[PDB]
Amino acid sequence: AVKTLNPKAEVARAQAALAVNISAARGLQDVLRTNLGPKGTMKMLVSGAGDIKLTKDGNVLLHEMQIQHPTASLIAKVATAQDDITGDGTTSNVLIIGELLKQADLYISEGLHPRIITEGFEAAKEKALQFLEEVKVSREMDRETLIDVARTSLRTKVHAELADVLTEAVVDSILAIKKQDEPIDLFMIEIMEMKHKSETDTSLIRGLVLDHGARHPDMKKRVEDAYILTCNVSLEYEKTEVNSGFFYKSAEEREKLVKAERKFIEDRVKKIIELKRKVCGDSDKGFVVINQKGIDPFSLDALSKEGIVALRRAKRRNMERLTLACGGVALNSFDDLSPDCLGHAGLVYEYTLGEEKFTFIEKCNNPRSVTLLIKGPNKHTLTQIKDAVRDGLRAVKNAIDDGCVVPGAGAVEVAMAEALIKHKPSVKGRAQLGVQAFADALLIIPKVLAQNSGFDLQETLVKIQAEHSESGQLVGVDLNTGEPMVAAEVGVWDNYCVKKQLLHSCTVIATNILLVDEIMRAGMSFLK
Amino acid sequence: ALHVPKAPGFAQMLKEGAKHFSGLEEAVYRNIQACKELAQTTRTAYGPNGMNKMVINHLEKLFVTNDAATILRELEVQHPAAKMIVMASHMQEQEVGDGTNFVLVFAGALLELAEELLRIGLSVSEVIEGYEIACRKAHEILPNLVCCSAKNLRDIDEVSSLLRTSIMSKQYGNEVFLAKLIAQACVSIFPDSGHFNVDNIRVCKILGSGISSSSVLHGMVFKKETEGDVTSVKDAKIAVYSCPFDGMITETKGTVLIKTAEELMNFSKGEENLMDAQVKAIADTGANVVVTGGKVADMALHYANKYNIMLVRLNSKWDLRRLCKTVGATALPRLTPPVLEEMGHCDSVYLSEVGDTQVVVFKHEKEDGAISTIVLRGSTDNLMDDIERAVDDGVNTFKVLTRDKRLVPGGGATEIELAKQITSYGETCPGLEQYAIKKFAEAFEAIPRALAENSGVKANEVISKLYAVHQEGNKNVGLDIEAEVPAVKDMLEAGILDTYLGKYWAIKLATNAAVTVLRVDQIIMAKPA
Amino acid sequence: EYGRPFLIIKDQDRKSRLMGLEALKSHIMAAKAVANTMRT
Amino acid sequence: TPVILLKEGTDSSQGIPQLVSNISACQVIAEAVRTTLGPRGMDKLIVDGRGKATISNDGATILKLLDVVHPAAKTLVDIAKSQDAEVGDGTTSVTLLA
Ligand SMILES: Nc1ncnc2c1ncn2[C@@H]1O[C@H](COP(=O)(O)OP(=O)(O)O)[C@@H](O)[C@H]1O
Ligand SMILES: Nc1ncnc2c1ncn2[C@@H]1O[C@H](COP(=O)(O)OP(=O)(O)O)[C@@H](O)[C@H]1O
Ligand SMILES: Nc1ncnc2c1ncn2[C@@H]1O[C@H](COP(=O)(O)OP(=O)(O)O)[C@@H](O)[C@H]1O
Ligand SMILES: [Mg+2]
Numbered sequence A: 001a002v003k004t005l006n007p008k009a010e011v012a013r014a015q016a017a018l019a020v021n022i023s024a025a026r027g028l029q030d031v032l033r034t035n036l037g038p039k040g041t042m043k044m045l046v047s048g049a050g051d052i053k054l055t056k057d058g059n060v061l062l063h064e065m066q067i068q069h070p071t072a073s074l075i076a077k078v079a080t081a082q083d084d085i086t087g088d089g090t091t092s093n094v095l096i097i098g099e100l101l102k103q104a105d106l107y108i109s110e111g112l113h114p115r116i117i118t119e120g121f122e123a124a125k126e127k128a129l130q131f132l133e134e135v136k137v138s139r140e141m142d143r144e145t146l147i148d149v150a151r152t153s154l155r156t157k158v159h160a161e162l163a164d165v166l167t168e169a170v171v172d173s174i175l176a177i178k179k180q181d182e183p184i185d186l187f188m189i190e191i192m193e194m195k196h197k198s199e200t201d202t203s204l205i206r207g208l209v210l211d212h213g214a215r216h217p218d219m220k221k222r223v224e225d226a227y228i229l230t231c232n233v234s235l236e237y238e239k240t241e242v243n244s245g246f247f248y249k250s251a252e253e254r255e256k257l258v259k260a261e262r263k264f265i266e267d268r269v270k271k272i273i274e275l276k277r278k279v280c281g282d283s284d285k286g287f288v289v290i291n292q293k294g295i296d297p298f299s300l301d302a303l304s305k306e307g308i309v310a311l312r313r314a315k316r317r318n319m320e321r322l323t324l325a326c327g328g329v330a331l332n333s334f335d336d337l338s339p340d341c342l343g344h345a346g347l348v349y350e351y352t353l354g355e356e357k358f359t360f361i362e363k364c365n366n367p368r369s370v371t372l373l374i375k376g377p378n379k380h381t382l383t384q385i386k387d388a389v390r391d392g393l394r395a396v397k398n399a400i401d402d403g404c405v406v407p408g409a410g411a412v413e414v415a416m417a418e419a420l421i422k423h424k425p426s427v428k429g430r431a432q433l434g435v436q437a438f439a440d441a442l443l444i445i446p447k448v449l450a451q452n453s454g455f456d457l458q459e460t461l462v463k464i465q466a467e468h469s470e471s472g473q474l475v476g477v478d479l480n481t482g483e484p485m486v487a488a489e490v491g492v493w494d495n496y497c498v499k500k501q502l503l504h505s506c507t508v509i510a511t512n513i514l515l516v517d518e519i520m521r522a523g524m525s526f527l528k
Numbered sequence B: 001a002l003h004v005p006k007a008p009g010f011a012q013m014l015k016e017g018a019k020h021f022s023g024l025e026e027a028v029y030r031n032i033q034a035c036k037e038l039a040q041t042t043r044t045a046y047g048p049n050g051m052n053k054m055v056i057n058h059l060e061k062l063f064v065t066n067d068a069a070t071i072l073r074e075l076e077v078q079h080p081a082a083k084m085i086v087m088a089s090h091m092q093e094q095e096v097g098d099g100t101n102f103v104l105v106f107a108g109a110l111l112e113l114a115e116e117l118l119r120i121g122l123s124v125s126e127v128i129e130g131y132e133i134a135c136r137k138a139h140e141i142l143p144n145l146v147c148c149s150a151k152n153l154r155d156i157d158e159v160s161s162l163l164r165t166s167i168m169s170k171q172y173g174n175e176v177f178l179a180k181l182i183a184q185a186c187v188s189i190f191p192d193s194g195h196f197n198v199d200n201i202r203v204c205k206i207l208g209s210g211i212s213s214s215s216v217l218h219g220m221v222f223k224k225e226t227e228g229d230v231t232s233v234k235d236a237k238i239a240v241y242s243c244p245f246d247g248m249i250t251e252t253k254g255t256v257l258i259k260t261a262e263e264l265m266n267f268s269k270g271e272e273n274l275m276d277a278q279v280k281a282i283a284d285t286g287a288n289v290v291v292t293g294g295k296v297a298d299m300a301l302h303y304a305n306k307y308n309i310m311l312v313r314l315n316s317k318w319d320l321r322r323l324c325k326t327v328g329a330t331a332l333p334r335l336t337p338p339v340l341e342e343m344g345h346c347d348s349v350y351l352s353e354v355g356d357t358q359v360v361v362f363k364h365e366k367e368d369g370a371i372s373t374i375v376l377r378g379s380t381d382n383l384m385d386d387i388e389r390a391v392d393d394g395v396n397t398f399k400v401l402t403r404d405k406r407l408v409p410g411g412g413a414t415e416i417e418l419a420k421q422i423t424s425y426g427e428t429c430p431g432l433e434q435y436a437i438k439k440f441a442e443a444f445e446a447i448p449r450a451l452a453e454n455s456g457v458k459a460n461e462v463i464s465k466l467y468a469v470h471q472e473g474n475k476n477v478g479l480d481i482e483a484e485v486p487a488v489k490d491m492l493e494a495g496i497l498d499t500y501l502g503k504y505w506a507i508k509l510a511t512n513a514a515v516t517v518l519r520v521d522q523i524i525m526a527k528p529a
Numbered sequence C: 001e002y003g004r005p006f007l008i009i010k011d012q013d014r015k016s017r018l019m020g021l022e023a024l025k026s027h028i029m030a031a032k033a034v035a036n037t038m039r040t
Numbered sequence D: 001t002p003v004i005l006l007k008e009g010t011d012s013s014q015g016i017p018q019l020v021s022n023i024s025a026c027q028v029i030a031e032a033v034r035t036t037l038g039p040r041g042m043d044k045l046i047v048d049g050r051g052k053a054t055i056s057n058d059g060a061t062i063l064k065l066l067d068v069v070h071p072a073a074k075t076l077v078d079i080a081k082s083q084d085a086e087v088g089d090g091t092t093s094v095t096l097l098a
């Protein structure tokens, strides 16, 4: 049809349209199945520029492998829409869709309409969600519980000597900035990375770290007690909005105009100096000025004669981290200066690392915006750690915002598999084939874990399914012996919202794919 | 004939020009080959008997150097697996400063020895676990081998014998003269608090007679002439300015406005008489030398010569700030006379010619200054650069001795003794990991092998002789160099010692770069562009 | 060691050189053509 | 083999043949200024790419007018500039001696 109207068209009719979507779905899963569990292998990614990126997370991998397909673009966008909401479950998303399309093809190839399978997915999706509500366990979410949840999501993206160090820095940071009410607000934990020393020196600083210091060589480098003045006023020489211009005379009137144009900016400096001299009469306290706008070299010479350590051009986000930490007020004008608008720190010292300068704010009274300091000897090591830190922070915020936690280790995928079998006869018609095919796709998480540890794929499932019929215990798969182990009494925990979103997402995409009739490309070759 | 098609799946969806290397026979065994080639290029430049290398970059600039890090910097590398070994060496240069070749030799022997273990059955995870266990053991044995720590860092007779090992490893033959120059300059700028700074030592290169004509000078020197007419002052008061030496103009667009004939005649005379008072105001404070950092004016130069003042211009910003520390002055952002604390006192400022180059010298008679410079002279532009780096190794050794004064016997007496203790530890571990710990100990023999091959003696007899003496208990026995036959010699008595912190960071960074390459399984490369 | 034609001067294959007596005879012949035009 | 270490075009040589071929490269620089020594020396004539002739008997300016690109031979041209900067005479006596 279309080939008669547009000769330069590419079409795929009848079952050639289903053979392209199935083939590519299984192609992305044979590469993404080696990343599952703490026993997955690391991958090397090299771009055209020549940089090196070692990643294990399914979202970073999918957006870095050179892949040009229409139907491989739909799965890529589903994983992105999970990383920015839940932050976990990007590898398990591709595996289930790739396998759910594989099982549904065994019945379509036997002369069966794809719509009959579709009705089976809807019934199986409603039973699976009603089964998950009774498996979750509601707890208080004390410190000891959040250690176990955070460790499960950090032991798969680093080694054991690092996850034990990064777990304490993530659990502590969330607790320090959480109030008794209101949702946990992110964007208040600055992630600073310095390329020095080893990777085991990644610590948590109760304060703020700024990537710039003082620009005068006559300013203090260590203050033991200081008032923090956070301001967003301009101390640079500025010009009138309307076009002006001096019109002077004999050379004496030129000198009367050069120092008459600096009065407006030297008045702002003289308001700070009197405020400093009032609250600090004796040379025993400091006075640190943090600005969001620039400062002239002239104003860095007036402030440095009184020991006013001043920093210029801070980021806009730090006008909110510095009020929660210290306790001042971030003001825009100087017409209402008062001692009530000043912060308080306990130690401000400067750190110089080669050609870059860092400033530390420590010993705050009641800090509410902590910072994380990342250290590592390689550029790609600081990116590998920064991915795990993001993963571990969204695994703790999810565990607090939802008062329930689901056990892991694959002990829950086996549980929907047994529940849906006894629900198969209750569905009338040929739609029982949808429920049987759905119960087979959910069993890929135990299969991949059993296969990545070096066991038998079939002999392990029969052992896991030998339990859970004779004892109502959520038994998972061990990753060192292959024996059935109970996941609720060891420490393996997942998130209730991660598993809930995954079931919702993996069914909607694989239902629209199975109903695609043809792949038509009749438009313009390129927008030109 | 027939053609083999493409396998369905990921291979059919790759972009053109990209490559995919997955498996153990295609990714791990090929990564070790690339890293083994890198170790054979920089090994020839190891020890006193190392050889130089002629490297030419793509700007047709020539490098004759013996540093391991400098060779890797001017060589382009297109292998990803060999690029991590380079970045592992560049990290030790910024932390310690010496020991860049140790990482290449060690990471080259750990990786090669792991290939043999992977064919006898051992898995990759068993090799990684075995190496880390051995790495921790070496960090406990190492402190027990420390001998002869530093006594006094302010004595010119003791510090000179501690930097000699660093220099002799790069300029053999001139290690006695060169060690007396760095030691004479580091102790002069050493403060009482003990906070040593590396940027306070300056090196200037003047094409001249020879290396033996080089000398140290407490002060600063410049490759510039004098703007004015006065070219020698005995006891000067330097007044440093940051603003240019001319009349002050407004930043907004300003213009004069002459409306009467009488104001037109007086305008030119008004500006000149205004400038006379400003220059005379500074001249009354005793400021014989004025140093600026901007543009000098023609009218301002006239009055400078009238009052016997010296005018020097330095348009380099940071070079101006270094002068403020040397003389003890402050930069004035405004053209106003300094009062009491902004006047730097020197001992002699004069313009002299050194090897057809007119230079300005801020000489000091006192030894307690802030910045000290070292004048280097040679016959070839290449010879002076090679000695520039050798000086920097000596300075960086002084900084490490400030932090940690502990020293270990060098010349191979540390690696062999570390090989005996690690080998015995692995014998007591029953399991699959005892094969990996033993291979870790055999990698420490690659360093004495590199010293024996470069000297011109049979290496196998050296390790044979070293192992027998150390078993008796002599842990201070290394390798003799002056001996034609492969003999041995005591190192504590001879005086060849290395820094404890230099080797502590060398092993940690070498093992880290070797275990990351083994963890890689699949490599997905994009189209080069 | 097979002393292959190593490059010494830039554009060595587009440059010529005369030495010895043959270069001295070329000067005289060049100055004999010029001075014989002005004789008339 | 499929992935190569250095770029395609990195020429490299080493060994005994590498060093002997450098001794034979300094024999060409020394022979360019061999016949300008003594009271009976003869000067040379060099032409630039534009057509300007530079006629001189001194080693320092002769070696500056040759577009020497050999890395080993470029050491002999650098020591000549050193001699004419320190003493100003004896430039062609350090080229035969080297
Ligand atoms: N220590 C462990 N032992 C057994 N199973 C684990 C362990 N850690 C994680 N898992 C399981 O591995 C599955 C996938 O985790 P992972 O691949 O790290 O991230 P993602 O959930 O994004 O795929 C989870 O469902 C979890 O149940
Ligand atoms: N006189 C000497 N005799 C024996 N060994 C020496 C002597 N001087 C230096 N060495 C050894 O040479 C080794 C390598 O030095 P060098 O190659 O210059 O730098 P790097 O430590 O970066 O390899 C040092 O570990 C030192 O122990
Ligand atoms: N009267 C003389 N008799 C013999 N030899 C002389 C006499 N005067 C100078 N010489 C020699 O001629 C040489 C001059 O070489 P010259 O062309 O000046 O070299 P350069 O230009 O490098 O100095 C000197 O080495 C000197 O030994
Ligand atoms: Mg995860």
Ligand SMILES: [Mg+2]
Pocket (backbone or CB within 6 Å): B098, B099, B166, B169, B393
């Ligand atoms: Mg060294």
Ligand SMILES: [Mg+2]
Pocket (backbone or CB within 6 Å): D089, D090, D091
């Ligand atoms: Mg002469």
